[PDB]
């Protein structure tokens, strides 16, 4: 009940301590129709080349560590044939499948928590003042929470507490999540499908969603245990579509 | 007795699943010379999931999007003055002077509908050096005159007594007056626009003004008192219901000028960027 | 006595409402909100031959 | 008579009630209705129409007709970038003031895929291909066509058929985004490139221009009216 | 025609008897981590007797939660000055400056519905030494004006003909006015949170501001009037209906800071306490 | 479609015909020891006639006698001051500085309903030495603040953006502004009555602070403006609907002491008269 | 659009009006309904409970418990009347304020039949008998047990059962009188004779009490909702 | 006309009224609905999803993650109270800006059960058990686990299931209590204790944390709409 | 439509009225002022023993 | 004449109402107050495979 197996193109996940899998709001992802789509040139599929799990890299979980986001699209656009088919076009659509691995010994202990959260808008250190898009994002490497209240300019407020969002950090449960705990389970598994309010989306303008991994109970060991533990994060496109092609943008 | 009605509820299109292809089927390909517009949904193009649709356009309906209340005149009026033409207030019936209701009626060249009213009235003191007086309640009239009718002269006139214009009388203090009006118009529906003139020699009165002809509102202080003055404010709102619009038009972009013609200013088609590459970078550590 | 019943908006994943008029003009009723047709193809597809999307639109 | 008790709500006026009211034209005669042609039912059937999309609103050009034209020619220039835009139908100056957009802007809420139709306005013997993307939120605007093409994408070839429809479907974490976008709800981004280049014979202009069309499709809405900020007075009689 | 429309009562859940055990059913051992909430009630974990249960949860659906009305917006303008700016009120259309609503909006990500809006006017005489005068009755109109529309630049400007803007003509001591707007919005659903740019190149405009774009409203006087000067308040107020949302949030904690953004300063999670184990005595004799 | 829908009437019972009787049956003796209430009618006493009797009890069921408006609270704010903390409106949300209707509630000890709040706002001048001036319409804004929000600080806070907050605008000489809010409670019913303590240790708030919870509202001008200042009132009406009640309770005798306790001070149990056998007589010449 | 025309009654606030009204939290998800014990359907439900009545409201016992008591004893008192009062349930000190009174004093009409429940609280060994009389307006109060005897009467003997039941059936020209009772609408009084007198063995008390309640009966009704003038402030947060 | 008759409540605003109004925009055709993930239907959905209680709400701690954290270590504590608060889930400062509490300060009255989950989160090697106990208002709470373990309770195991579910049964003697608790609807108070205490191998950390999550049950159900005192400003534009 | 159709409050010794539904939420509806049950024995009776009322009490 | 009657809300331990719409837009109609659907599973149970509660969640 434990092992679990997930294949998507030529890649494959295997694990032996999962919980379980959550499906973000009992809706699995899925091509647009045609009653509900109003872009009326006929869509490319890739199919393979873009529906596999592509690997961040990864971060190091240390006794006082705040937490770390990333934003989804826009870390996978220099990731193979997805990223080189969202510079091409205007609109894309896609759900993902996200694995988190995270492991340690039966004399380790921690739990971290792992939610999605859909149009995750952030606010400046500054209250007078906007934020930019260096502060909310940096592709493949992760943005890092704060300990304390964040100040200077340009920056984004993120003492982990208020989650950035101006929310209490203990409600996050709302969004798909799931926990690891030390003692229990090494992986947490989310599929999240296309979320919006129109059936497609300019992929470098908007960011579907945020990916928080944020540490309820610290990491703590003692002798002679080892020191470094790492998370890795593993996200796949699925049902991925595309429309509108003209010259490749740039940024 | 009870009668069962049944309202059928819309939704929009499910989009189907599909998969790879490759033929001689080109949905994608189209000619916008004939006028026509490419019926083509996402599974025409890409690879699709199956999704079942549950939203609903029920608010983008005509008559949700033009059943609510805008205020269209407001005008002033005085219990003592040494004008006797400032005691009453009057004005024409239309709807071209406030311009967010007369933006919106404009998106179609012919309307039809009944019509709720409601009237807002608000008094004031006016600024005296000595104050100090208690005033009983006070108490308004409300004629509409169609055309054709006597028009009153003071405020002390014969004609209101308002033997068969109808009127309202209200005092203050309680609930805004409201009544419903139907259709009245000697023409089939209602005309937004008139490229057209009112003599047959093509001169006289251009446009809109030649086809409204649909009377005038008269109000006034009934007490007839106040030895120190007071300042009267009235409001009217329109609320069409049971509509009915025909041939759809581009909206407006320039700014209104006045109330008669559609005379406007030349203006941008938007504001500028800087090169038509041009990409705000949002994702920045 | 004259009443009408009919079904309330509510959502998708006790609902029926009565009403009664008392006026004897009909411009005295309130709003028809429960209406909801569309004919969209007067406007967006007004060509006498028909065009069937999947084959081109000339030749 | 009969007892009764009055709750909070009374006497106020909401300018969104629906209500009965009296009538001050009993039993008036209302004239015959008339089946005039084009009769609108739902504001999504203007929405549905293409209107032409201003792509070139650079300095200088917001006056002209230059405004609506995208200009391309022959000659090696592939790293070259035709255009590219964001994903805002209410909120961008490339998309605020046409059909779709006008409709739009009295609302809050809009959820839906777009249509973007392509037309080649050159001479009959100018070939050509080209390659249009678009990328979902998440990174920035692609820089070349390799990146590019890793999102959705269509390539277009030019011949009898002149024109090509890009659809953009909803891709989105949440059913309805913002009419006015912020960063949460952000959409993604449209651009255009060479995939071969233009070629002529002697004898035939170098320059052409493409237009570009917008449209919603059959699954688009809206919802949460609201006024809109594109009309506005200083006082009365205007 | 009479037709019966059935309504479904919707109730809570009976609990039912329950009696010793000694099993290997261990219904309180769950595990948190797999993001599932357990579904126990008492009658998994104690003796329990049979309760026939007839509450309703008829108050907390969204429409009963969301169907009432609420000020979104408040205004001033007079009828006399010397700034000719300050002779009408106008303003951008949104619900972001009255913090009650819009922190029940922000529940949810996505909302869509019609809205009935009504209008609230008021006017006071201004501070003079003299004062002493009879006013007529107050007119104030109300114009709409949907993006892209000409802009009045004084009150006695030409778009104040309002020949295509729907507007709301008012006279104070009547019933407020009122009028219903459909859904208007070029998506499929109104966007609460918006975390993109409005450039392709990931820059300019952040947030909410990208999506709005409704248009806005202008309000004056009719009379043109009043040697002494008055002052006028206008309050407007909103009430969503046939609503559906979707995606919730967690609520706002820290205070709203400006209209355009979600900026905020950094608040505690709750007020403290004694220690982990303070019990307040309230037995005591 | 149309759906008929009974409606059950329901009227007293009738008195039946009864003649003289000479037996063992006693249906006048009883015994109050039991807690019971004697079901004795006139006809087991008295020789009675049949009467067919039509009386209804329909204006004391509870929805009948619950659903009217009441005022809740009524508060003060201005458009020019040297404080900035009187230039907006602010409070807490109950229902309990009015004692009519909080009388009026506090009959059960819970309450279960949906509420329509409706909203009268009016201006007026200060009283300066020199009037006279020409002011355009007022617009005020009313927002709803859930717990957890930020608070505003003054009437340029960015908080005023009310991007998830619901809120209301309107402007004077409209209908009075007016929405609906379903049940919102995180128990079952609401509480009137809370025999018990905030803190574990049986101490810390008593009574009924301690569960209601239910955020604020707050209330601005829009304009900013107005040289000459002015002064606004807001008052605030409630009507609950669909209604469910449960354990009545006796009336309150004392008069009410504050909004927080249930403190009173001693009455009586009535007023005097001359003798326990006292008669007005009311038949002379 | 359609044409309309206003009525009288438009923008004015009802306090007893029945309106729709948009809902200002969409979709909100109210909390599940639970079968709480003891649920109240119709005001006319508390007013057929029992109450106690304060028939001894003289000067100086307004705020103990002997305002409840009525005094009888032993030996020869047969000339002295027990206790009178008026049939004024809404207006009268000695009904006004039980639970009764305080239904009817929401409203301004009332009709049906009353219940009134003696019990005697004296020692077991306690023996008599009382007569309890009720008179319809039209004359003045009898001054003697002949007097009256002649109206609707009942004779309560004292035993093993505590409680007799005096009912005052509906007698009226009107089909409802007014809370607020004047001469038009009077109702009668209520009188209590010795019919025999109180006998007591040795080492027994004296001096007994007899106590009342009032309720309604099931032909029961009021209407015309108002204000209570029992409850008032001088100044809001009370 | 048709004669009628004004009665009170005429043009009034009540704003919580249910009727029809005029559209100012007639035949407007509205965007087709979409059909977005995760529709809310009732607020009670919301309510019933498990969201963390900040437990130790001391002085020093109320802006960091330590305030969810229960601590608990090894060796002989068991006469140490691990942790204790009342049960008012709108009003203590432990569950008020919760899921539940922040759904329940928008209305009066609730009902119903309520289910706290608690989750170990110490390493693989640790063991231990605990007794968490309910105990019925009427008394002060206890100071011991013998006093405790006479209320309502359950003995917790730790071991490959780390969630114990504690359920709040509903016992009052009224159907709804107030959101704003009193002494007269109080619900009573939670404690725990060591059962046996805390026993590790060598090379482990010898302390220890506990989380708390709140949730209702399928019973609990709210009424009363009110607004909340959460929220608030000074001026408009905020 | 939808529309519900009921009977109006009459006297006793053309009288129905129609009703339709505009919003989404049950919570913007009118109140329901048409439902009249009872049960005072709740109150009035609430003994675990039955008592005739023509039978003494006790004995 | 397009009449809905539908039932009222009331208690429990003549009562229904009479409607009719007046306008053409269905913007017009009142608020669907009567309208209680629940689907809580989307939120408290999203997970992949069933969950029984009376055996282990793990194992």
Known sequence: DRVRSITLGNSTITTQESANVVVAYGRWPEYLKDNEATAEDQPTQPDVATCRFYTLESVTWERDSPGWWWKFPDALKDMGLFGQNMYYHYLGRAGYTIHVQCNASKFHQGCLMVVCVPEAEMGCSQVDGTVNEHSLSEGETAKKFASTSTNGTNTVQSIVTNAGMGVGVGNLTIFPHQWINLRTNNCATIVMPYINNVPMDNMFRHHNFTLMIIPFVPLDYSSDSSTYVPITVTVAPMCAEYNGLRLATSL | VVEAVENAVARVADTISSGPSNSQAVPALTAVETGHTSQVTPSDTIQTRHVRNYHSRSESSIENFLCRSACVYMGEYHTTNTDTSKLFASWTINARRMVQMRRKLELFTYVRFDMEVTFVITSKQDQGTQLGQDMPPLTHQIMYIPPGGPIPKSVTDYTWQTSTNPSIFWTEGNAPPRMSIPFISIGNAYSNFYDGWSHFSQNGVYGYNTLNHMGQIYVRHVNGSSPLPMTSTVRMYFKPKHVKVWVPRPPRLCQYKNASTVNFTPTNITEKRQSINYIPETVKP | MGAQVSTQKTGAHIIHYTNINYYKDAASNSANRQDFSQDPGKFTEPVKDIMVKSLPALN | ?238
């Open chain 4, 1 to 238: 008579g009969l007892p009764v008790m009055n709750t909070p709500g009374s006497n106020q006026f909401l300018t969104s009630d629906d209500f009965q009211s009296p009538s001050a034209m009993p039993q008036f005669d209302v004239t015959p209705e008339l089946n005039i042609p084009g009769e609108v039912q739902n504001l999504m059937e203007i929405a549905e129409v293409d209107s032409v999309v201003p792509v070139n609103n650079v300095e200088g050009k917001l006056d002209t007709m230059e405004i609506y034209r995208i200009p391309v020619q022959s000659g090696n220039h592939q790293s070259s970038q035709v255009f590219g835009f964001q994903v805002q139908p209410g909120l961008d100056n490339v998309f605020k003031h046409t059909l779709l957009g006008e409709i739009l802007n009295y609302y809050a809420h809009w959820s839906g895929s777009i249509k973007l139709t392509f037309v080649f306005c050159g001479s009959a013997m100018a070939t050509g291909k080209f390659l249009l993307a678009y990328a979902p939120p998440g990174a920035n605007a692609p820089k070349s066509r390799k990146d590019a093409m890793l999102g959705t994408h269509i390539i277009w070839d030019v011949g009898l058929q002149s024109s090509c429809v890009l659809c953009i479907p909803w891709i989105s974490q949440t059913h309805y985004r913002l009419v006015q976008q912020d960063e949460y709800t952000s959409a993604g981004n449209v651009t255009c490139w060479y995939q071969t280049g233009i070629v002529v014979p002697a004898g035939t202009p170098t320059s052409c221009s493409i237009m570009c069309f917008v449209s919603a499709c059959n699954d688009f809405s809206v919802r949460l009216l609201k006024d809109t900020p594109f009309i506005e007075q200083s006082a009365l009689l205007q």
